[PDB]
């Protein structure tokens, strides 16, 4: 099976470096092109340059020449962009994709969430979301994930969930800390009954959480 | 860079209705180096349609591309609820490589009412000084929806954080989260919060409100 696997999101401060990689299995690493690419929330994506790891050659858009350096080392199978001097606007997703066909992009990383800011790194509070004491066959549940930076954070319950019963909203920064909700709705009967478990983890500070939602005394 | 401008922008369709979407070039690009990708919320594109025809591994066949010079299309015979989505177009005649702005193709399904829930502050919570009240809007359409917050009758803006999901994979509703966030001071000041929801399903709010006197 081929694959590319990113490294994880990073915070760096304005005026600083950036260096992620790209580590390629499955398949012969110095046959293949890798291209880099940035997509800011919300735009298409933005072509920033390609690895020839065969002949160490690297090509780049005009606009990034200066900003951008691809490297790779052939003894690990992994390709490598610097990103230098940044800025809030370097603030996106950055992938990795490999150079298949008439120059189509056929298997992609999984993308690193780049955040360009002056804030600080700070991990998760998660507080439970329990009713208020005041039952239908179904109950709503969920967890408040409030007070981290940068992006992201994962969110995965242990649940009786029923069918479209698990939603995970997208964070909205405020005041340089995201907030961020889920929602689970399960059936009455297992519910304080049945142990649920919200489960948090944010990967730039290196921390989890795993918080259960136990009914308001 | 050859701009690639695809439309419509944004588009709704219901299922089995046929579907054609285009990217227009502003310069001449080979077909052999034109195409399409895939992408929903959260995910990396897929390769959809590559050399402008030809179908990736694992694309349903209701999809097809055509196009020559500067005009493309991806069409797809039968909408189906798994292909709502953001489908980019590529050009690599010339470096550097384009990509398009994207038509994201939305599902129309029959409306559906919010399912409203609101959270008081956890305890954990009111130890940090803050308190916040969340209301989830659960498994509605259309998307357009207002939300309202009341303390003792009256209305509070400020400290009001919302965000949408995208349509769910399996119902196609959207869902809303409305957290109202004050100190613990101002919150511990006022005895009831409710979260009110008007949308097109009904002529009266859909709403449900917490008291501190009863917890
Ligand atoms: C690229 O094209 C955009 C859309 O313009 C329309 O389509 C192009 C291909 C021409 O046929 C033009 O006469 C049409 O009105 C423009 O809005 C945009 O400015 C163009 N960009 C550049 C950099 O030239
Ligand atoms: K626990």
């Known amino acids: 099976e081929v694959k590319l696997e990113e490294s994880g999101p990073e915070l760096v401060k304005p005026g600083a470096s950036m260096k992620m990689s790209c580590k390629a299995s499955?398949?012969?690493?110095?046959?293949?092109?890798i291209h880099w690419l940035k997509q800011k929330p919300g735009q298409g994506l933005e072509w920033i340059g390609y690895?020839?790891?065969?002949?160490?050659?690297?090509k780049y858009n005009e606009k990034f020449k200066g900003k951008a350096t691809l490297t790779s080392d052939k003894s690990s199978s992994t390709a490598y962009m610097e990103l230098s001097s940044l800025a809030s606007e370097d603030s996106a997703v950055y992938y990795c994709?490999?150079?298949?066909?008439?120059?189509?992009?056929?298997?992609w990383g999984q993308g690193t969430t780049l955040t360009v800011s002056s804030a600080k790194t700070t991990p998760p509070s998660v507080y439970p979301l329990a009713p208020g004491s005041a039952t239908n066959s179904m109950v709503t549940l969920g967890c408040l994930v409030k007070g981290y930076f940068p992006e992201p954070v994962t969110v995965t319950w242990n649940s009786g969930s029923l069918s479209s019963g698990v939603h995970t909203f997208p964070a909205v920064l405020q005041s340089d800390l995201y907030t961020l909700s889920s929602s689970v709705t399960v059936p009455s009967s297992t519910w304080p009954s049945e142990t649920v478990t919200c489960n948090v983890a944010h990967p730039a500070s290196s921390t989890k959480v795993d918080k259960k939602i136990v009914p308001r005394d | 860079d050859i701009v690639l401008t695809q439309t419509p922008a944004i588009m709704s369709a219901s299922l089995g209705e046929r579907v054609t979407m285009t990217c227009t070039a502003n310069?001449?690009?080979?077909?052999?180096?034109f195409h399409w990708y895939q992408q929903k919320p959260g995910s990396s594109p897929k390769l959809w349609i590559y050399?402008?025809?030809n179908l990736a591994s694992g694309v349903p066949t209701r999809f097809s591309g055509s196009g020559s010079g500067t005009s493309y299309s991806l069409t797809l015979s039968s909408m189906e609820a798994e292909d709502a989505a953001t489908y980019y177009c590529?050009?690599?005649?010339?470096?550097?490589?384009?990509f398009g702005s994207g038509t994201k193709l939305k599902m129309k399904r029959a409306d559906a009412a919010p399912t409203v829930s609101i959270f008081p502050p956890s305890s954990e919570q009111l130890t940090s000084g803050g308190a916040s009240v969340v209301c989830f809007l659960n498994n509605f359409y259309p998307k357009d929806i207002n939300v309202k917050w009341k303390i003792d009758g009256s209305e509070r803006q400020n400290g009001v954080l919302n965000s949408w999901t995208d349509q769910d994979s399996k119902d196609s509703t959207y869902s809303m989260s409305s957290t109202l966030t004050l100190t613990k001071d101002e919150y511990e000041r006022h005895n009831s919060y409710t979260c009110e929801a008007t949308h097109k399903t009904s002529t009266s709010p859909i709403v449900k409100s917490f008291n501190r006197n009863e917890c």
């Open positions: 994709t490999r150079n298949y066909g008439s120059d189509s992009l056929d298997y």
């Open positions: 499955g398949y012969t690493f110095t046959s293949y092109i």
């Open positions: 690895i020839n790891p065969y002949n160490d050659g690297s």
């Open positions: 310069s001449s690009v080979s077909s052999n180096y």
């Open positions: 050399s402008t025809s």
């Open positions: 590529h050009q690599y005649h010339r470096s550097p490589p384009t």
